[PDB]
Amino acid sequence: PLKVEKFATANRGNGLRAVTPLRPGELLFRSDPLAYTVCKGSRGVVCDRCLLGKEKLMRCSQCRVAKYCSAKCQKKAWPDHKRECKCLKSCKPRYPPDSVRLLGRVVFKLMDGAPSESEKLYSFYDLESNINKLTEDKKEGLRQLVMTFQHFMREEIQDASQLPPAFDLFEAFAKVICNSFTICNAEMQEVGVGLYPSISLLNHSCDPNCSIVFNGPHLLLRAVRDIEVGEELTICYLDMLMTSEERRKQLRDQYCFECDCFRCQTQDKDADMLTGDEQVWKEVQESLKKIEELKAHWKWEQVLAMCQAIISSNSERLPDINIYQLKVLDCAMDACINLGLLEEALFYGTRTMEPYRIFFPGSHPVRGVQVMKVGKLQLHQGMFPQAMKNLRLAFDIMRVTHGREHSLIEDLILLLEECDANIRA
C-alpha cells in the first residue's frame, strides 16, 4: 500500500491525497519520464540522455542533431531515439518545437515500448486536456502543432497504424500543454521537458505541501511539511518570483484555471515584490526577456554583460527584493559561476540570500540549491565560518527537498565535512 492515492476532487478534477500522515522530507513517489527531450536552448550544450553539460558532446552520426556525452549515453538512449532520428535530419537547418519532439517520443513509447512505470497511478490516456476551456487562439496553436507533427513524423508515421488505438493528435497536444514538466539540472537550469503522468495527478498551489526535484531525468516527489490524513497533495506549477497577476496569467494561459489559494486571495507579497523606481524596474523587466533567452542558450558572457549594466548601472538602481532585480542578480551569479568568476558570483549570490528566504518560504529546493551555491563559493574562497553557516542551512532545506535519494545531497555532505575541518574546535 502506498501512502498516497488518486481521488476525484470536488472541483479540480482528479488529484492525489495522503492516506496516512506524512512528515517533511518523506519520499512519496519517484519516476523516470514516460518521454523526455532536451529543451530548445540546451540542445547541443547538454547531453540528450543524461541532461548534463559537457565540454565535448558527440553528435549522433545519422542525424547530427542529437548529441551525447558518451558511448554509455548514446547506447542507453538509442531505443528511445531510434525512430525520431530520420525526422530530425530532414528538418535541419531547422528543428521542431519541443512539444512536437516530445509527443513523437510518447507516440513511439506507446506502440513500441513496454508499459511505463511512470504511468503506475495515472496514464497518458487519463491526462487532463481542458478541451472545453481552450480559447480560439489556443486551439489555433494546437492545430498548428498537429500539422507540424504530421510533417515531422511523415517519415515514421503516415497513418493510424503507427499511432496508438483511437489517438487524437489535437487532444494529445492539449494534454502535452498542461502536463509537460520542465526538467531542471542540479544547478536549477532548465534543460529538458518531459511527461510524468503519475506526477501529473498533483494539483497546484502557490503555497504547496509537496515538491518535486530532478536528478537528471529522474523525478523525486517529497512532502515539504507535515500533511494530515486525507489532505490533498499539491505542488507549485510556477516560479516563485511572480506576482499574483503574473501567476494568474500563466495559470489561465497554460492550465485553464483560476487559483483560489489563500496567497492569491490575499495578493500575498505582491507589493513587496515591486518596490523601487518604476522607470527602472519596468525597463529591467523588459531587459530580462533577452537576458533569460541568452541564459536558456547558455550564453554566459552575454548574460553577464547585460546583468552588469543593470546591477552596477551608473543610473538609478533597484532594491534586491524587487523581483526583477533579484532575477538579474541570480542570472549574473549563474553566469559568473559558469565563467569561473567566483568572487563576483559570491557578491551577487550573497545579495540574493535574504530575498530568497522571503520568497521561498519553508523548504523549497530552489532556495536549498541557491544557499548551497553561496556556501560553496565561500568555502572555496576560505570564508569558513560563513560557508559553514550556509552549508548547514542548505542541508536543513535539502534534506527535506532532495533527500538521501538525490545525488546532490552526497555532494553537499562532502562540502560540510570539508568545511568542518576548518572551523572545528
Ligand X SMILES: C[S@@+](CC[C@H](N)C(=O)[O-])C[C@H]1O[C@@H](n2cnc3c(N)ncnc32)[C@H](O)[C@@H]1O
Q: Which residues bind ligand 4ZW (CB under 6 A)?
A: 5, 19, 179-182, 184, 190, 200, 229-230, 235, 237-239
Per-residue CA distances from 123 to 127, 245, 259, 391 (Å)? 7, 32, 25, 39
At closest approach, how far in Å is the CB of 16 from ligand X? 8
Separation of alpha carbons 105 and 82, rounded Å: 10
Separation of alpha carbons 411 and 414, rounded Å: 5
C-alpha cell at 169: 493528435
Kindly determine how many residues on this chain lie close enough to bind ligand X according to the rule CB under 6 A.
17
C-alpha cell at 288: 530580462
At closest approach, how far in Å is the CB of 398 from ligand X? 25
Q: Which residue is nearest to ligand X (CB)?
A: 13
At closest approach, how far in Å is the CB of 111 from ligand 4ZW? 23
Kindly determine how many residues on this chain lie close enough to bind Zn ion according to the rule CB under 5 A.
15
Separation of alpha carbons 76 and 54, rounded Å: 17
**Closest CB to ligand X among 58 and 240?**
240
User: Residue length, the chain?
Assistant: 425
10 Å Cβ neighbour count for 69?
20
Helix or strand run (H / E) with residue 67: strand 67-68
Q: Which residue is nearest to ligand 4ZW (CB)?
A: 230
Q: Which of residues 173-212 bind ligand X (CB under 6 A)?
A: 178-179, 200-201, 203-204
> Residue 15's binding partner, choosing from ligand X, ligand 4ZW, Zn ion, none, with beta-carbon cut-off 5 to 8 A by kind?
ligand X
Separation of alpha carbons 201 and 234, rounded Å: 9
Of 76, 197, 82, 39, which Cα lies nearest the Cα of 128?
A: 197
Contacts of 49-55 with CB under 8 Å at 24 or more apart are 49/73, 49/74, 49/76, 49/77, 49/217, 50/216, 50/217, 51/183, 51/185, 51/191, 51/192, 51/216, 51/217, 52/185, 52/216, 53/185, 53/191, 53/298
- Binding string, 116-155, against ligand X, x = CB under 6 A? -----------xx-x-------------------------
At closest approach, how far in Å is the CB of 95 from Zn ion? 13
At closest approach, how far in Å is the CB of 191 from ligand 4ZW? 10
- Binding string, 203-222, against Zn ion, x = CB under 5 A? ---x----------------
**Closest CB to Zn ion among 138 and 263?**
263
- List of E strands, 272-409: none
> Residue 181's binding partner, choosing from Zn ion, ligand X, ligand 4ZW, none, with beta-carbon cut-off 5 to 8 A by kind?
ligand 4ZW
Left if phi > 0, otherwise alpha if psi is -120 to 50, otherwise beta: which for 344?
alpha
- The response to whether 13 counts as a known ligand-binding position is yes
Backbone angles phi, psi at 142, to 5 degrees: -65, -40
Q: Which residues does 118 contact at the CB level (< 8 Å), separation at least 6?
A: 31, 32, 33, 34, 195, 196, 197, 198
- The response to whether 364 counts as a known ligand-binding position is no
Burial grade of 187 (CB within 10 A; 0-12, 13-18, 19 or more):
middle
- The response to whether 402 counts as a known ligand-binding position is no
Give me the residue label for grid cell 505582491.
270
Binding segment for Zn ion (CB under 5 A), chosen from 116-124, 212-220, 253-261, 352-360, is 253-261
> Residue 156's binding partner, choosing from Zn ion, ligand 4ZW, ligand X, none, with beta-carbon cut-off 5 to 8 A by kind?
none
Using CB under 6 A as the binding rule, whether residue 15 contacts ligand X is answered as yes
- The response to whether 69 counts as a known ligand-binding position is yes
Using CB under 6 A as the binding rule, whether residue 14 contacts ligand X is answered as yes
User: Do residues 72 and 79 touch, judged by C-beta distance below 8 A?
Assistant: no
**Closest CB to ligand 4ZW among 16 and 169?**
16
Q: Which residues line the annotated binding site for S-adenosyl-L-methionine?
A: 12-14, 122, 130, 179, 203-204, 237, 257
Binding site for Zn ion (CB under 5 A): 47, 49-50, 60, 62-63, 66, 69, 73, 85, 206, 259, 261, 263-264
Binding site for ligand X (CB under 6 A): 12-15, 127-128, 130, 178-179, 200-201, 203-204, 255-257, 259
Q: Which residues line the annotated binding site?
A: 12-14, 47, 50, 60, 63, 69, 73, 81, 85, 122, 130, 179, 203-204, 237, 257
